[PDB]
Assembly symmetry: D2
Homo-oligomer: 116 residues x 4
């Protein structure tokens, strides 16, 4: 599990449950190719998106579908989604945790990068 996503809800003070996440990887023709997807669990975490073999060097985009999350709770938010774009594994394999904190008109995102 070299890529994990955590999401928290700043209005409720709780994990953000059932948040859809789509990961893309930039292809040779400079388009975003679908790479992996999933949803956050009751703990707000999304595990098992990829494997060490599959998660090669590249530029990755982690799209967090924040609008669908808020609308399912009856709230009209500002952003369409949160996009996190980064180069991965350029100095060898690393483990990446993408963390996000959500409010209807604001969000924060952090990266925790560790070396196995």
């Amino acid at each position: 599990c070299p890529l994990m996503v955590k999401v928290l809800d700043a209005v409720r003070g709780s994990p953000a449950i059932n948040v859809a996440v789509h990961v893309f990887r930039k292809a040779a023709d400079d388009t975003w190719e679908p790479f992996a997807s999933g949803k956050t669990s009751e703990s707000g975490e999304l595990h098992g998106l990829t494997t060490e073999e599959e998660f090669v060097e590249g530029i990755y985009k982690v799209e967090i579908d924040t609008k669908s999350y808020w609308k399912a709770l009856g709230i009209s938010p500002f952003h369409e989604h949160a996009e996190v774009v980064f180069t991965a594994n350029d100095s060898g394999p690393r483990r990446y945790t993408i963390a996000a904190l959500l409010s209807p008109y604001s969000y924060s995102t952090t990266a925790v990068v560790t070396n196995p």
Copy 2:
């Protein structure tokens, strides 16, 4: 004025209006002494808290009454207030902007220090 406070509301995407703000200065006996206070304007800003003459080096605390703000909007908050504690240091001319972004169970605060 060398000290200004700005407060934003992350739930409504708006300035945080009519928020009470209290500034304290640390006295020699280690207690917090009232220094200045006010309420944020329609733009979420509080100007005119102090003057360069009065804002000497020392430790200051800015207390933002976030609980009352959320209660007035019918929203149940977590924190009693937001506290920002910092040292004022002289080191050339200095303007201090204390910014805060409020959510019911979260807040962020930033210091913008400019010449």
Copy 3:
């Protein structure tokens, strides 16, 4: 101007100066079309991006070139850039301020929408 961008630096406690910002509008064929761009000023702000005539309802993306900013300061960043994607909706007069607070491995963004 109905759209403004503000960028702050959380490491130095200062405006983020000379940061490139690109705005795109979603076209009918689902691609991102260049719409406006500029560089943040000494106050970290980018004004005059568009006009009320041109800023019609639709989906917009604001791209902040954070990687170049940190590299110019000798700091190694994580993100390629910061992207802010939102729908502009009419619903009375509307000013949009897109604010961003930058750290090397983190960023926050807020929308302040005022009448």
Copy 4:
């Protein structure tokens, strides 16, 4: 473990290690009485501050010694510390996670509150 503290470093993209944390509780005379203290581990987490029996109703202050953290890394930060003040257990026992994200001139704090 009804009270836990997590701290992340936004400059390094890593847990904030060896951050001192002091917890206080408002006493009957309206002073802050020392309640518990500890330091974050290599994971950035501080466990074992208190017990269900000890952690009664009250107003609590969690002081995170951010200045000492940055100065130990050779950085001159803005804030003296981060203070998180809240009423706890007013509707019965809850579990509280205080999370913080640190930059030299900025910090964010969130609360995750769950019911056992």
